[PDB]
């Protein structure tokens, strides 16, 4: 009777990294007459906020806004505090990680390099072996280089081996970067808080629910009814079938 | 007859890193009835904009806004393009620099580390051996550590030696960070563009005009009438004496 629908963002509600279609948006508000609705994305809040309305409207349009996998949470218009990756990991392991990344990147000799190789967020370190500080022509340029030299991939292989058994996970962040987060700080993190809000059912929709994907763990988790979608139209489709039959 | 007064920001017009006193601000507008006025700061535009009014008002209140030593320039309400440190330095030297900084920082084992060790701006690399991504308690904490271990200072000594004769300059950025810029991209950079605006006199005011300080080179440059000030009140004082005697 208390139902929440929880959506991944990229590919599930919106074209990847882009604004939502006003028609999907319009539907989500309709869905809201029956159930509460929320989103969970890997990206920071501002990025998510941008894709889903104007300014900070997203927190008004959605009952739940879980950014950075849920390490950052908005609930019914208001911010709830965030745990810090350093509080969770502690300083020593976090610095072993950081120094390893610095020492590995120092040895990479590329065509170009830019800035902000290691960005410290709430629920992850975002690592970019070229530089988060590049333009569009440069994003595409490194994107090509990464494919050819497997830069991120080899870096991740080396990181996983070095920190084997120490509770870190790595997943790519699309172009030029990868994330490093504590084990358990994938999308499932948001479920722990949601456990306290007395939902009878939590429907999750995601487009990467296959093994490997960033939606897998939350989709497979026994706390959710899992749904696999291919597009924003597939998502609306499914919600119609279940909630408006 | 065409006169410009050009002010450094921190310590010259405003308490360091802080909002301008409405009384100084009020005076600067009065000064503007006689002469054009401008500012030049080491910081980025947003930082400068914040200290000097609300939002982007600074470009309306000042005839010239030279941020990042002049590599970024506003002139009479509008932005003029910026040269890029990489266009000036080229990719190879810039990456030698970057990799050297990465390799040096990887070997620093500190109490803590955070993120954004190398921030790529327009007219410099800002290097922070702890992490630009820290809070106030942490800024103060590293600030203490830096004093005791001479972290930035030893890093700079090593950088200057390594890149001896290669045209790079280093100056500290107050707490936790230092800047790396091409030789000539201190405050004097803004004078090259100002040369094209047909001023009969350019008065410069700065509080670090002693050798070593970030105001020295522009103060000593034969293109300006140089003035040494100790406070925002000293600045207003001097402008009264010269322009309102
Ligand atoms: Mg997705
Ligand atoms: Mg499930
Ligand atoms: Mg000053
Ligand atoms: Mg002079």
Swiss-Prot record, chains A, B:
Instruction: Give the record's pathway.
Output: Nucleotide-sugar biosynthesis; GDP-alpha-D-mannose biosynthesis; alpha-D-mannose 1-phosphate from D-fructose 6-phosphate: step 2/2
Chain sites annotated for binding alpha-D-mannose 1-phosphate: 17, 121, 132, 139, 175, 177, 179
Entry keyword annotation includes S-adenosyl-L-methionine: no
Its domain of life reads Eukaryota
> Quaternary structure?
Homodimer.
Q: What's its job? A: Involved in the synthesis of the GDP-mannose and dolichol-phosphate-mannose required for a number of critical mannosyl transfer reactions. In addition, may be responsible for the degradation of glucose-1,6-bisphosphate in ischemic brain.
Record protein name field: Phosphomannomutase 1
Reaction(s) catalysed (UniProt annotation) = alpha-D-mannose 1-phosphate = D-mannose 6-phosphate
Q: Tell me the compartments it is located in.
A: Cytoplasm
What stretch or stretches form a coiled coil here? Answer: none
A biological process (GO) of this protein is: protein N-linked glycosylation
Cofactor list: Mg(2+)
Which keywords appear in this protein's UniProt record, sorted alphabetically? Acetylation, Cytoplasm, Isomerase, Magnesium, Metal-binding, Phosphoprotein
Q: Which InterPro entries match?
A: HAD-like_sf, HAD-SF_hydro_IIB, HAD_sf, PMM, PMM_cap
Q: Where is the active site?
A: 8 (nucleophile), 10 (proton donor/acceptor)
UniProt entry tagged with the keyword Electron transport: no
> In which tissues does this protein get expressed?
Strong expression in liver, heart, brain, and pancreas; lower expression in skeletal muscle.
- Record-level Gene Ontology MF annotations: metal ion binding; phosphomannomutase activity
Phosphoserine, modified sites = 231
In which family does this protein belong, per the annotation? Answer: Belongs to the eukaryotic PMM family.
Briefly describe activity regulation: IMP, a metabolite whose concentration is elevated in anoxia, inhibits phosphomannomutase and phosphoglucomutase activities and strongly enhances glucose-1,6-bisphosphatase activity.
Q: What is its main location?
A: cytoplasm
Locate the residues binding Mg(2+) 1: 8, 10, 207
- Fetch the CDD domains from UniProt: HAD_PMM
Residues annotated as binding Mg(2+) 2: 219, 221, 224
Q: What are the annotated GO cellular component locations?
A: cytosol; neuronal cell body
């Amino acid at each position: 009777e208390r139902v929440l629908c929880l959506f991944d963002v990229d590919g599930t509600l919106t074209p990847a990294r882009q604004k939502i279609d006003p028609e999907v948006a319009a539907f989500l508000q309709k869905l809201r007459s029956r159930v509460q609705i929320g989103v969970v994305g890997g990206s920071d809040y501002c990025k998510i906020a941008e894709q889903l309305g104007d300014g900070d409207e997203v927190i008004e349009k959605f009952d739940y806004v879980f950014a950075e996998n849920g390490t950052v949470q908005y609930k019914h218009g208001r911010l709830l505090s965030k745990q810090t990756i350093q509080n969770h990991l502690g300083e020593e392991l976090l610095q072993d990680l950081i120094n390893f990344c610095l020492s590995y990147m120092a040895l990479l000799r590329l065509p170009k390099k830019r800035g902000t190789f290691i960005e410290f967020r709430n629920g992850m370190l975002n690592i970019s072996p070229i530089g988060r500080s590049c333009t569009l022509e440069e994003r595409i340029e490194f994107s090509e280089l990464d494919k050819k030299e497997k830069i991120r991939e080899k870096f991740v292989e080396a990181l996983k081996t070095e920190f084997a058994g120490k509770g870190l996970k790595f997943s790519k962040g699309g172009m030029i970067s990868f994330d490093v987060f504590p084990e358990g700080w994938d999308k499932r993190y948001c479920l722990d808080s949601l456990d306290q809000d007395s939902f009878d059912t939590i429907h999750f929709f995601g487009n990467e629910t296959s093994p490997g994907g960033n939606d897998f763990e939350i989709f497979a988790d026994p706390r959710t009814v899992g749904h696999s979608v291919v597009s924003p139209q597939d998502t609306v489709q499914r919600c119609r079938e279940i909630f408006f039959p």
